From a paper:
The KCNQ1 ion channel plays critical physiological roles in electrical excitability and K+ recycling in organs including the heart, brain, and gut. CaM co-purifies with the C-terminus of KCNQ115, it has complex effects on channel kinetics, and is a required accessory protein in the complex where it is needed for trafficking to the plasmalemma, folding, and tetramerization. Here, we report cryogenic electron microscopic (cryo-EM) structures of Xenopus KCNQ1 bound to Ca2+/Calmodulin, with and without the KCNQ1 channel activator, ML277. We utilized a biochemically stable form of Xenopus KCNQ1 (xKCNQ1, residues 67–610), bound to Ca2+/CaM4 to perform cryo-EM studies in the absence and presence of ML277 (xKCNQ1-CaM and xKCNQ1-CaM-ML277, respectively).
In xKCNQ1-CaM-ML277 samples, ML277 was included at 100 μM to ensure full saturation of its potential binding site(s). We obtained cryo-EM structures for xKCNQ1-CaM at 3.8 Å and for xKCNQ1-CaM-ML277 at 3.9 Å, both with C4 symmetry imposed. ML277 binds in a hydrophobic pocket of the TM region formed by the S4-S5 linker helix, the TM spanning S5 and S6 helices from one protomer and the S5′ and S6′ helices from an adjacent protomer. The ML277 binding pocket is lined by residues Trp238, Leu241, and Val245 in the S4-S5 linker; Leu252, Thr255, and Leu256 in helix S5; Pro333 and Leu337 in helix S6 from one protomer and residues Ile258′, Leu261′, Gly262′ and Phe265′ in helix S5′ and Phe322′, Val324′, Phe325′, Ala326′, Ser328′ and Phe329′ in helix S6′ from the neighboring protomer. The binding of ML277 does not trigger major structural changes in comparison to our own and a previously published unbound apo structure, with the pore remaining closed. The xKCNQ1-CaM-ML277 structure shows a similar decoupled TM configuration but a differently twisted C-terminal coiled-coil domain. The native structure which was determined in this work is shown in light blue. This twist was also observed for the xKCNQ1-CaM-ML277 data set 2. b The twist of the CTD in the ML277-bound xKCNQ1-CaM (light green) compared to our and previously studied native structures (blue and brown, respectively) shows a displacement of the backbone by ~1 Å at the top of the CTD (Asp526) and due to the propagated twist up to ~3 Å around the last modeled residue, Leu556. There are also local changes in residues that line the binding site. This includes a significant conformational displacement of the side chain of Leu256 to allow ML277 to bind, which would otherwise be hindered sterically. There is also a possible rotation of the phenyl ring of Phe265′, which was modeled in a position to allow space for the 4-methylphenyl group of ML277. All residues that line the binding pocket for ML277 are conserved between xKCNQ1 and human KCNQ1, but several residues are not conserved in other KCNQ isoforms, which likely determine the specificity of ML277 for KCNQ1.
Residue numbers in the entry:
A (entry chain G), C (entry chain E), E (entry chain C), F (entry chain A): 95 to 206, 215 to 384, 497 to 556
B (entry chain H), D (entry chain F), G (entry chain D), H (entry chain B): 10 to 146
Write the structure that this text describes.
């Protein structure tokens, strides 16, 4: 049980203990990154190299110990059993990231001491806090849900960028600015300007000079800034709708009977293959039994899917149609019984 | 192929070439399951490929074509067992599994519960690895 | 059947074969565009002209062959039959784009070799990947759905731009900057600055200098940047709602009976015109029959439209009202029968 | 014009100047179609211009005014045939068309099915071009 | 009838005739504005003054005639009758705008000829196309619906701007840039920079120089750009939801019975005041009658409001509860009748 | 009653009197802030110091009187009774802000007179208008509702910023610009540029010079501007959905019976503890009574929560299932009674 | 004030101090309107201030307090007449008004229709200005 | 602990080890409350931890475990009293409280109303501080 408790405390935070542990680790990583920035500053390197090295040694030892204990505790779940299960757990990208960071830091500190590794490893280790993927998983789910509109937006934006950049390049190909430098010397420079304008940054290093270029830039800016800022709005509305449906979902006590029925039907279908078994409690009759069990499995799977998915107007109308048909059938039975009596 | 026609005709019992809700209910009553009209309608909807309202032989053939070993089906069974599984781990007590199978949802009897626990807990332990159980299935 | 298979593989991709074919074609087009950019760079033209010419010849031959085979395979669908059907297919904008690109490339390479055609044709041929219009069609549908609010936003933004630009032009008409150049020399320059500010680019070439101009620019920026960035949010929310309703739509097995009923009613109405026909199986009676068939056609069309459209609360309430009226009528019948009996 | 009053009065049978659900149902029963109250209500809703609940002579005139040859109606028929049409092409087998017409949705008999296939497949082939069929309609 | 037709053609466009008329008028106004811009350009004034004057005379005559005919045709509707009705119509802001433009143009051309009127009048007359207010009305409705969140956003943004601008002013109060000019010479300049940054323009004329200023600017930018761009997203989502509910609204044939009932109940309540009237067809009894008529009026008003408003889940549940109560009451009546019989 | 009226007029505005009072106070504060800006301007200090001092004295006296009267009137509500209740009211952040502003202004004017207090106190006192927290409370509620997606967006944006800034720093570490200054002299400067670009400001002081840097900046800008502008869209959609659900909420007359039932059940549960009480009107029986009362309390609490929460499809389906079960049970009872009779 | 108690007690007829759906229905039946349970429930909901389910004397007092001449009520009547008004103008034919009043929605008789048209079309013309009619109301 | 089994068995009356809707309704009828099937179903749903449809002894134990003094419960009672409280203040008249308790929602009798007002208005004043009342609870 201690293995499960430590695995929960190290990978699936639930209490303020795990919260403060992760917060302290992230704060230490951020402090090390800030000291790396100070070292990269040309005037603050000699007074920071020693403390950077010491903090790097302490942090690499700490992360090695953390990775070892996490590997030991990963065996709590049944999916990770033995050497093969531990390898399967380590194959996960986050574990791969941690292993790569650990080995790179160890080899860098063994070699060392001016090197870019002591900084790029901090850059990559700032990513270690994304445990369980509770952020990247959500982002990927939303992007995959909206992939069609996202691709449409990207394609329209890129095509508009290319066309307008070429038009502006044709407009101001020979427009010498005040500083005696060609603002648009080549289609590459024009494309850089187009990217800047569509991204709505406006560095100002390259600005159109001729009136044709100014007019084209204005029209294309007004008609393409919306498209190149569209993904922000799309993802925002997607996130809002997703959280609304999440707060509209049914409670977890409405899935238990459906899961039970699904498991029972699956077990019945599995046992139908074996001729001598206890499942034969209510040749051709055996085939009918297995077909009926398959149908029960399918209907149980559909019911479980509908129960898991948040309630919908289609579910409401289906349920009402079922109830209305039941009531109509029973009323017809009462009517025919009354007709028989009289 | 040949058995599909015999099985389809077995539910027919009238030679009309089409299976309906009343026909399936009569077959179920003869078998001895005592179903309800809601269950009959749900089954007909789930097996009805086109959705006209009845069951045809091509629809029965398609239903036979779709079967187990699907990755989606295995994932569904896995997450259902996970929902039944407390502590977020992959292990559930044999007593808890027996209780939930015999009470919650569909009802099961002693012999089938014993067969289920025998097939699940292959080793002499009080826990069952549902991942390996599904993989064995 | 081979004609249909090749048409599907060339215009309606369904498998990884078609996916990789289109990906390779798009990648080749992008590589040719990048080499055209390198050629347009003044220092990388002599070493790139020959490879650009060779790649252009290869690509024009490939696209000519692709267009020929697509024209041959377009006859699979019944809409394109014979010479007239092939012409109708070629009249489609994408086919027109491909034909124009092919003929322009052929004539350019026959004339050639410094020319802007070898680059503008690549710019236009980057658009060839938009097969079936699965992107432009969606964009046009959403824009046409939101046309009223989009026009409102465009009009408000343009009017605010014009008014604020004129006010700033009046404010800083005679404000000489540090570089001894009139920042706002004319209403044209002031309008260019206004466009830059409303589009939220901020090139910085033209910046107000007097405090009145600064105050007006600040107030108008705060009160008009939202309006000139509004279309991004509008289109994003529209895309999100459209994809939500798309994922909420009913399955395709709920449209078949409605389509069958619509076709049957249409055929009955068509056959009602012919006096001697098999449709006369259950003068004035003929008129009543044709009127009833017309009513059946109308109700079938409405039912099909409702079935195709995603389920709605109005559909739910209509269906419940129908069922409740049925139940009330049958209960009234039972009540009157019981009263008659007793 | 004159026939509209006679047709409207034909459904009346009581001279009250207004058509109701019960009146239309009685007319349908006399014709021999055996309808239901839901169908009657749907028809009354579809022909009722104002939506009060009954059918008036101006509403009947408007219903007569709206007729076939509409571009929207042709598009609807075209996409319905496309939904019935597999492979995404414009051709469907005559046997499949016969089966779907005689079983799915509304029921049709042998003579009307034969007339439909004769009017659709003008040439001696196993496929029907629904685009040309609708254009002929 | 001709008066109504011309009023519809001039103020409520319905056909392509009115569409092309308004398009031509707007295009002429835009052409005049472009020529005014050319005249404002210092190098293109002598060749444009004469044509500007001639076009201004033609356009002022045309707009005077249009205003006269619109005033004559405004009497079609009952709201505008006689001199008082014409004055009430002219009191509308659009008519006021047209009258002001006409009189200002007439007086300017009578005085004239270098004047700013011949340009500001064009600027204001570009607004004349907003007939019926079908744009400003929608914008005002949405803003009034979202007023609470809009005020919250404005207040938070303004407070953040003020606080961060003061902090940056304290940070870089004495930071001389390379050009030997105080980037932040006063809190006014710091506030201008803050407005630029929150509006996400980035002119670059004023940029922080000290590291404290850079850090504060970065943090405040990341934490306040979202708030100062919030109104765009709010209004976009509001427009999208409004158009979705507009397309979800019930047909116009479901409001007629409710309007009829409301009018009848209002007339009954009005006639209840008169003692001798035909409304007395089914002292204390009169008071009961008038109270019942008042209750009928209230319930009819509520029913009309619910019918006009788009269908809602609360309407669905209310209607189902009513139907269920009716069915329960009738079943109870049948049960008691059966108990009495047996 | 006068105490309650003055408390309402001073803290919970309801009428035009309170509206104009708050508007006048806010306008006076804004005027004082503008005069402070003029004083901070180096050329407009001597002519503004005296009026700033006089206005500060008047405003501090007015705010002291307002705070005293608000403290006196805070005793109307039962939550604030006696010295402890007044202290509890003063512990509220807005009261703390007012007290801090008052004491700081008094001490500053007693010390004075060049000081930054006479300006920072105005900056902080511009916040005093946010009475009742009707803005910050809404903002905090929405942020707490969307916390998961907001944290995801912040983390993804920060990680992308760090990685891309490091890549650009590696690209253009030794790229001397035209002005002979290192555009990217250190990772700190590169990170400042990255923050500017992701926030989409584009000051232009630091711009990439090498083509590798330009390409990396373009790609990262296109792929990260959406993420760093995401919170605007998220909060906008959240505000729109919140106001839609607010306008969809049920009337306040549907909560009264639920509140009554909750209070009655709570009182019954409380009185069940006392053995001798009037609640014993319909040992082991006492335990059954208290268990039943606890169940009634729980069901009443759930019903009140559902009634307070806006109507939902899950509520609709639950209510329909309850009604259908009731109807089925009663029909079964009628059927069994009829079978018994016959 | 005094008449309110008498009017409230008039609907009572049992001295319990509270008005219920059954009581109001019995009063309506005695008057001779022949109402329905749905109408009774809607009226009780519309007059029930708190929403408990019955009608109290304070609620009756509040209902009496809220009355006509409200700007919202006038606007509602105006837009209802506009919906009845074709051509978007402010004029409707007297014959069309008579037809809609006598057929659509609530039913009216000849005498009340004549009074309505007399009060609306004060001048001898075939059109009625509903704006002025409402203002007169 | 021991009393929980006795209380759970008290509702049983049949020794089956499970409590159902019919069993609880029979217990309530024996007590003399005269409940309805909707109330029974709502109570079973509110006490049913898993949601299978019946009440188990572990579910009864959990229901006993969850009890009063919860901050959420106190907040709910406070805001309910605030909703009952006009003027936005914390004081309500004793007469108004008596009227609402005896009429609106659940019905109460004179003795229990007197006990409630005695426990609420400890001091001889016409107002009750519901905050202090809840704190005393
Ligand atoms: C506030 O003022 C407004 C008002 C309306 C909009 C708006 C929304 S959608 C939309 N359609 C567009 O922007 C589409 C379609 C209409 C023409 C312009 N394009 S293109 O540039 O993408 C483009 C560029 C280059 C190439 C080769 C193809 C396509 N225009 C934006 C801002
Ligand atoms: C975060 O801080 C905020 C708070 C609120 C908003 C906001 C939303 S909607 C709105 N109404 C507006 O922006 C409208 C209506 C109010 C006055 C300003 N205009 S005008 O410029 O278009 C404009 C400009 C020129 C002319 C000739 C006509 C109209 N103002 C924006 C940002
Ligand atoms: C992508 O990275 C992100 C992640 C999260 C957000 C985000 C959303 S809401 C929010 N709360 C805010 O921005 C609030 C509340 C938290 C502290 C900062 N403010 S304050 O500046 O307005 C502000 C400034 C000055 C004064 C005197 C008062 C208040 N921060 C934005 C971008
Ligand atoms: Ca059959
Ligand atoms: Ca079928
Ligand atoms: Ca096991
Ligand atoms: Ca009739
Ligand atoms: Ca009608
Ligand atoms: Ca054919
Ligand atoms: Ca009563
Ligand atoms: Ca009441
Ligand atoms: Ca009149
Ligand atoms: Ca039991
Ligand atoms: Ca249970
Ligand atoms: Ca008290």
């Amino acid at each position: 049980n201690i293995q499960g408790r430590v695995y929960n405390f190290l990978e699936r935070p639930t209490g303020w203990k795990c919260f403060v542990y992760h917060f302290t680790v992230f704060l230490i990583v951020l402090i090390c990154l800030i000291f790396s920035v100070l070292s990269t500053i040309q005037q603050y390197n000699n007074l920071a190299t020693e403390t950077l090295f010491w903090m790097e040694i302490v942090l690499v030892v700490f992360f090695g110990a953390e990775y070892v204990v996490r590997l030991w505790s990963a065996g709590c779940r049944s999916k990770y059993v033995g050497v093969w299960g531990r390898l399967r757990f380590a194959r996960k990208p986050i574990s791969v990231i941690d292993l790569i960071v650990v080995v790179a830091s160890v080899i860098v500190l063994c070699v060392g001491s001016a090197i870019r590794g002591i900084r790029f490893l901090q850059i990559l280790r700032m990513l270690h806090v994304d445990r369980q993927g509770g952020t990247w998983r959500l982002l990927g789910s939303v992007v995959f849900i909206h992939r069609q509109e996202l691709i449409t937006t990207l394609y329209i934006g890129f095509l508009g960028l290319i066309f307008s950049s070429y038009f502006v390049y044709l407009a101001e190909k020979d427009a010498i600015d005040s500083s005696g430098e060609y603002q648009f010397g080549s289609y590459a420079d024009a494309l850089w300007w187009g990217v800047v304008t569509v991204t709505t940054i406006g560095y100002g290093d390259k600005v159109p000079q001729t009136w044709i270029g100014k007019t084209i830039a204005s029209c294309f800016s007004v008609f393409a800034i919306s498209f190149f800022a569209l993904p922000a709005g799309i993802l925002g509305s997607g996130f809002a709708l997703k959280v609304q449906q999440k707060q509209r979902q049914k409670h977890f006590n409405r899935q238990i009977p459906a899961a039970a029925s699904l498991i029972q039907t699956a077990w019945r279908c599995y046992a139908a293959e074996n001729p001598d078994s206890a499942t034969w409690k209510i040749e051709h009759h055996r085939a009918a039994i297995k077909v009926i069990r398959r149908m029960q499995y399918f209907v149980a799977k559909k019911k479980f899917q509908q129960a898991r998915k948040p309630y919908d107007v289609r579910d409401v109308i289906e349920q009402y149609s079922q109830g209305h048909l039941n009531l109509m059938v029973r009323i017809k039975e009462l009517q025919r019984r009354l007709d028989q009596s009289l | 192929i040949a058995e599909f026609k015999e099985a389809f005709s077995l539910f027919d019992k009238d030679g009309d070439g089409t299976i309906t809700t009343k026909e399936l209910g009569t077959v179920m009553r003869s078998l001895g399951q005592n179903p309800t009209e809601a269950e009959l309608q749900d089954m007909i909807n789930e097996v009805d490929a086109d959705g006209n309202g009845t069951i045809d032989f091509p629809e029965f053939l398609t239903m036979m074509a779709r079967k187990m070993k699907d990755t989606d089906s295995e994932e569904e069974i896995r997450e259902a067992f996970r929902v039944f599984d407390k502590d977020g781990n992959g292990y559930i007590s044999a007593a808890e599994l027996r209780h939930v199978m015999t009470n919650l949802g569909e009802k099961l009897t002693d012999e089938e519960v014993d067969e289920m626990i025998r097939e699940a807990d292959i080793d002499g332990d009080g826990q069952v690895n549902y991942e390996e159980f599904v993989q064995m299935m």
